[PDB]
UniProtKB/Swiss-Prot annotation, chains A, B, C, D, E, F, G:
Location relative to the cell: Cytoplasm
Gene: bfrB
Protein name: Bacterioferritin BfrB
Chain positions recorded as Fe(2+) Fe2 binding sites: E51, E94, E127, H130
Positions annotated to bind heme b: M52
Coiled coil: none
InterPro entries tied to this protein: Bacterioferritin, Ferritin-like, Ferritin-like_diiron, Ferritin-like_SF, Ferritin_DPS_dom
Function as written in the Swiss-Prot or TrEMBL entry: The major iron-storage protein, part of the heterooligomeric bacterioferritin (BFR) complex. The ferroxidase center binds Fe(2+), oxidizes it using dioxygen to Fe(3+), and participates in the subsequent Fe(3+) oxide mineral core formation within the central cavity of the BFR protein shell. Can store up to 600 iron atoms per bacterioferritin protein molecule.
Catalytic activity: 4 Fe(2+) + O2 + 4 H(+) = 4 Fe(3+) + 2 H2O; Fe(2+)(in) = Fe(2+)(out)
Keywords recorded for this protein, A-Z: Cytoplasm, Heme, Ion transport, Iron, Iron storage, Iron transport, Metal-binding, Oxidoreductase, Potassium, Transport
Further remarks about this protein from its record: The unstable catalytic diiron-binding site within each subunit (Fe1 and Fe2, ferroxidase center) also serves as a pore for iron uptake; the ferroxidase center is labile. In the iron-loaded BRF crystal structure additional stably-bound iron ions are seen inside close to the ferroxidase pore. Mutagenesis of residues reveals other stably bound Fe cations in the interior of the BFR shell; they may represent a pathway followed by Fe(3+) to the central iron storage core.
């Protein structure tokens, strides 16, 4: 089905953000596992998987709309060097992701691609849940202290 | 069955206390969940549900006694700004609630409304159990320190 | 995640309508039960529980958006004196509620809070279902007569 | 298999009657559901389904006989404005349907299309059963009163 | 509940489209079955059933909004004479359907009938899925040859 | 029970046709199996068995009516030497069979042997189902090509 | 455990190859699904998953050896425009992958990193199995013809 050219550009921009997030979360997960913080490693693994699923749906929608999904261009991974930085890196990425999602939804609504809008809204719900998780973790570090916070994430 | 007018006023006063507690504990619960202190959130949710069940019984008794249950007047919520304050606000409310229950039981006894007394004794038992929980948490904070206490209430 | 201040105002306005509905429906339920109209009492109980669940989700959303959920202000309960009046009082409340829901969705859309919009849309679907129920009950009173209508709501 | 051209015309006439009945009974069903007369709505739904199944079998037979099933022409729906009228409308349609079934069977017998006759006979058995149901409902309205009759059809 | 007059007109237009599709898909299904292409026949039968379910929901929504669902007016069925034509006929119908759905969604959004919009969005998702299927089948005919394509659709 | 002599002659004529078909279909089945076309072989085996069952019922009816079932005279088998010809031979035999069935039914009707007619109508329904199958297979050979049609009938 | 710097460089080069393969196979998979070639799509999906699992093990090994896994640099994807090209693009990539694996194993052996060698050997066995699959599909295209080959990959 011949999609709107600018919808497809937006879907490819969101896809680009998801591909960054896949790799950043996967690397953060395996860093945390290497460090023995297995609960963080597993949670971050599931965040990466969830972004893989979003990327899949975007790829599928783009192809249906007769566009070319862009899996070649990979933007800048934000990799932290300790737990606090890694969480804040994930949050910085998520805040750019939701900004782009909102702009993509505006455009889909304007050209009446209501099915693309619905897909993007579901992804935005998932990204807002991730922002909640991240904000909560950074707040817990302040409330229980870093040493306790890390302790609570050793065992899965 | 036509009840004693002052009994009914007492029941509506206890009902008003329970209505404050429902909302205060529900809000405290959801604040704790938002902060990632999910064990406190869950426990405080169950406290709110328990007050809802008490309010239901009081409403049912007032209507049986041919009074009008007052669900319109809502007194002042005592909302804390951190875990310690929130627990102490709950305890302050409970000590007012138990005082009012004792005075209501006295009057039920005097006019021989023994069934209303038994209902209020059962509610009083639940409220004393809540006082026990609250005093215990405040003591644990002193014993284990706030950071550990909060750590212990992150996970259900 | 810092929400739009006027969105939060609207969410608190919706929450306030839900808090009225919780108490109005609960009281109506318990009145119908006291009168032996247990099918109406049970259905109205489930309507109250549904509004409790909506209020919960609104509280959770307001807190996520870093606002303060208002559980203190309780608007006017519309309590009926017989079955026809109680149903019409519920319907009057619901119509006010959907009006406020629609105006809140308009503003969510305008500021691109698409997740808040989706939550309100879901609540609106539940409120329209309640309107359907109420309009149907009122029409059935006219079709079968009040005595038959009440007969048919004695037993669960 | 090359069918008799006039058998096929008869089968298309019967199909045309079933297509009217499908839509008429489906609309009547959904009206009764909307009004809260859910027992009527469910029964009328099953009548519409039963007509759908007859139409399928007729379509299949026409194609086997190398005719063209006519799903394009839709005759006049007989829609009531209240329960008594809707039942009479169904009965009026059913009396027309059995008249046409009888004439189609006559012709099948004359040209020795005994298998089409057997199909039409089965449909006629179903349509007479619907007449029995309809005559019975109209008779019950007289015996129990319209208000009682409607009351008995509120709940499934 | 009193719905918007033009919303109801849009909903009747969509319903009118679904009524055409039900009959077109059902006939195409039974033609394919008659020809021994039973996998196409079965798939097309499920397409017709899906349209029936959409029509049901539209009728229910129109009646709730106090409109009259129009099951009398049946537009032009697009019937093919071979498999390629039948698939293209279905696709031509679906493209008219999605244009009308998008225009209906615009109007629901403008009068704030967000529940009707959500229903139409769900139907639109189903229609785009059908378009995907149709475009894919037409493409497969080119990639594998017509004879192979039909061979692969003989057996369910 | 003393049957009509000409009915019994008609029943023996139908029996004779069934006896031809048993052997023709059984040989065709075993030819197809020998050629590796096992799906045709299995389907044709089941056609032969069904004919065996009809012959059994005809034998039983003739004896009940105090006639002598003729199993001695075997008419001409129509044996094909390739798939398309075998199917055509089965179809040719079936078209002779249904012509005889219709004339037999006419006579049963005339002399009021309604039970014999019902038996013959059932047999006729089975033979028209075989005609449907055969016409469909011949149609498929044209639509998918002989080589594909055969390919699709190698395996069960 | 401090690893050999040149081993880690080899592991990151293999990881780079796996990352190209993840995205190339995933895009090819979803292209094939879009075209209705679901068997190819599912198989290619499983190939992508397998490369993801290899990349995971490489990331984990690099981190254990105190290196930095490179998920930032994504090499050139080889995307085909039809089935034949897509298979050949996969084969061209795999043949570069096995050349790099062999050179990395040589270096692991020389520096006595026998565990990294064993990992790479296991990955090589997987890549040789992928080469077998690809060479086999290309051979089948010649043996059965492209139309049949694609037909055989329509359905799962
Ligand atoms: C375009 C990029 C990618 C896409 C679209 C993608 C997609 C997927 C999908 C759809 C799944 C299955 C999820 C499920 O249903 O449970 C999955 C699983 C997985 N992915 Fe990815 N992925 C990508 C990149 C990666 C990368 C770069 C890695 C590792 C460095 C990776 C590691 C994994 C792992 C370990 C699994 C679990 C497989 C299993 O054990 O079953 N993925 N991926
Ligand atoms: C007049 C005030 C209220 C009354 C009398 C009341 C009563 C009840 C009762 C009897 C139950 C069922 C408990 C059980 O047996 O498990 C219940 C459940 C519940 N209530 Fe309330 N309630 C009130 C106010 C509220 C408020 C203000 C909220 C939230 C803001 C709320 C949220 C809930 C929730 C979430 C549930 C559980 C529902 C479920 O998932 O099953 N209630 N309430
Ligand atoms: C040519 C006209 C139609 C034909 C031949 C037809 C045929 C059928 C058939 C064969 C079934 C399956 C019944 C069973 O065995 O359970 C069915 C189901 C159904 N039909 Fe129709 N139908 C037609 C029109 C309609 C219309 C106009 C509507 C609604 C306005 C409708 C609504 C339904 C529904 C709701 C179902 C059941 C779906 C489910 O399984 O949930 N049909 N139809
Ligand atoms: C007078 C002619 C025949 C009659 C009335 C007849 C009747 C029957 C009947 C009633 C059955 C049981 C069917 C069932 O209920 O499943 C049967 C089975 C069978 N018939 Fe015949 N048959 C006749 C001739 C033949 C011939 C000529 C052959 C082969 C050359 C044959 C081969 C078979 C086979 C293989 C079975 C399956 C037996 C088993 O494995 O259980 N029949 N027949
Ligand atoms: O919070 C409230 N509790 C109440 O009862 C109430 C109202 N009552 C109207 C009379 C309801 C009534 C009538 C007959 C009967 O037998 C029992 C009760 C009105 C506004 C607010 C409230
Ligand atoms: O009904 C009410 N809703 C409220 O939020 C409230 C009050 N809030 C004090 C601050 C509560 C707070 C503080 C920090 C935070 O991160 C989130 C929340 C006080 C009285 C009555 C109400
Ligand atoms: O309602 C309708 N029934 C029909 O058959 C039809 C049309 N037929 C085109 C020929 C379709 C055809 C071709 C070959 C075949 O073997 C069987 C059928 C066209 C418009 C509307 C209708
Ligand atoms: O296709 C059609 N849809 C319709 O509604 C209709 C007719 N309506 C009669 C009024 C039916 C009515 C009455 C009261 C009510 O509360 C809701 C509905 C008449 C002919 C054909 C059609
Ligand atoms: O193929 C044949 N069918 C027959 O019936 C038959 C013969 N009949 C002898 C009498 C068999 C009989 C006797 C008494 C009775 O109550 C019923 C039947 C002889 C040769 C060939 C055939
Ligand atoms: O793709 C990438 N892989 C990486 O490692 C990386 C970066 N490294 C930050 C250091 C992260 C680190 C710190 C301590 C430690 O013990 C292990 C690792 C930065 C940008 C991109 C990439
Ligand atoms: O990252 C990438 N996404 C792509 O689509 C792509 C390339 N496409 C070649 C055409 C692929 C194609 C051809 C026909 C068709 O109907 C649909 C798609 C090439 C390099 C990198 C990328
Ligand atoms: Fe600790």
């Amino acid at each position: 089905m011949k999609g709107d050219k600018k919808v497809i550009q937006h879907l490819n921009k969101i896809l680009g953000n998801e591909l960054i997030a896949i790799n950043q979360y996967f690397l953060h997960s395996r860093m945390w596992n290497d460090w023995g913080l297995k609960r963080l490693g597993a949670h971050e693994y599931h965040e990466s998987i969830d972004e893989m699923k979003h990327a899949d749906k975007l790829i599928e929608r783009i192809l249906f709309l007769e566009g070319l999904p862009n899996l070649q261009d990979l933007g800048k991974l934000l990799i932290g060097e300790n737990t606090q930085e890694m969480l804040q890196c994930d949050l910085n990425l998520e805040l750019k992701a939701t900004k782009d999602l909102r702009e993509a939804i505006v455009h889909c609504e304007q050209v009446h691609d209501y099915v693309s809008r619905d897909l993007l809204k579901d992804i935005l719900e998932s990204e807002e849940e991730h922002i909640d998780y991240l904000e909560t973790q950074l707040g817990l570090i302040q409330k229980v202290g870093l040493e306790n916070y890390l302790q609570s994430h050793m065992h899965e």
